[PDB]
Amino acid sequence: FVNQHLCGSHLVEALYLVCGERGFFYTPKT
Amino acid sequence: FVNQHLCGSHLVEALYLVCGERGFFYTPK
Amino acid sequence: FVNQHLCGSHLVEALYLVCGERGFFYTP
Amino acid sequence: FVNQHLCGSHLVEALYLVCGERGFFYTPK
Amino acid sequence: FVNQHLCGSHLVEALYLVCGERGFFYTPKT
Amino acid sequence: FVNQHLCGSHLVEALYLVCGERGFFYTPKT
Amino acid sequence: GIVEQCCTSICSLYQLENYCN
Amino acid sequence: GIVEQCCTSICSLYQLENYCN
Amino acid sequence: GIVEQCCTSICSLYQLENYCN
Amino acid sequence: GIVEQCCTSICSLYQLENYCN
Amino acid sequence: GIVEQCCTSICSLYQLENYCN
Amino acid sequence: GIVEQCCTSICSLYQLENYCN
Ligand SMILES: [Cl-]
Ligand SMILES: [Cl-]
Ligand SMILES: [Zn+2]
Ligand SMILES: [Zn+2]
């Protein structure tokens, strides 16, 4: 689903910014 | 460090593309 | 100066997420 | 849905490029 | 909804990473 | 290397907005 | 608003300029 | 997950902070 | 064309490379 | 301004909110 | 090339346009 | 760390894959 593919692109960019120093995990599968 | 800050935004976008389904962990520090 | 130019593209995306419904004025 | 939300991120980016040193106003509501 | 235009935006970013030094062509028709 | 790498990313997105329906060729070296 | 104008249909550079300061 | 949850509705930065490690 | 090929179904890295110079 | 302040050093989410309407 | 002209000083939308198909 | 490795010099796609889950 490209829609979900696009959204996740945008969600990794927001996590980057919100998490700062701590980092995050990106685990779509789920 | 803003150059690093800027580069890191681009690295997560590249990790998202490359990793796909597997996902990735991003740990700056 | 391209470095500042590249940085404000990132700052406007950040402002977009932080501000939400408030919006913002972007004045370099 | 979040279509509007995704579209707005792209619009702020296009305004940034179009407006240059002028700056711009982003007022959704 | 500008879905196609949004998709396009992401495709050129993906093509820039993938193709590297080779570059690429972007024709919205096709 | 990185600085020009980062600028090229922003460059293709500006070409995408500017060229619209005509499309474009991105060839870094050329 | 801007999202109603530019997210339903694609806006030209002339219409985006309207929001420049 | 985050997709089902933040792709069907908008997550505020406070909902996003939960996925930070 | 690219848009036809990759805007409904996700194109992999290998399909994207078909559009490299 | 925002530029001298946030392109010099990394601005937190708290600092950026001073720029919101 | 483009990189040589647009990665040191800002290229305007008019200059970028000479690169379109 | 990826920052030190890929912010100093450009990581190929193979190099970035090193950091996937
Ligand atoms: Cl999108
Ligand atoms: Cl950058
Ligand atoms: Zn998008
Ligand atoms: Zn950037």
From Swiss-Prot, chains B, D:
Changing residue 22 to Q: In MODY10; reduces binding affinity to INSR; reduces biological activity; reduces folding properties. It comes from the Eukaryota. This is Insulin B chain. It comes from Homo sapiens (Human).
